[PDB]
Amino acid sequence: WQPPWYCKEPVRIGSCKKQFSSFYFKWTAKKCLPFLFSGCGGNANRFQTIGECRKKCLGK
């Protein structure tokens, strides 16, 4: 692994009055940080558990 898209890909929440759990891979950290996603306006840097986290941005 060498870093592709995901790691440097921006965190987006969206805007509607319910939030679902998410993790984004933080590029200057080297691990995933938690947030919550609303639904109405995200991207694709969102790992559903912290075990999916490492498969896009570490080579594991």
Ordered by start, the domain boundaries in the chain are 1-60
Q: How many CB atoms lie within 10 A of CB 31?
A: 12
The SS3 of residue 5 is: coil
**Distance separating alpha carbons of residues 11 and 50, to the nearest angstrom:** 16
- Asked if 33 and 57 touch (Cβ cutoff 8 Å), the reply is no
Which string of DSSP letters, residue by residue, matches 29-41? TTEEEEEEE-STT
Q: Which amino acid is located at 21 in the chain?
A: S
For domain 1-60, give the CATH number: 4.10.410.10
- Asked if 28 and 48 touch (Cβ cutoff 8 Å), the reply is no
What are residue 36's DSSP bridge partners? 21
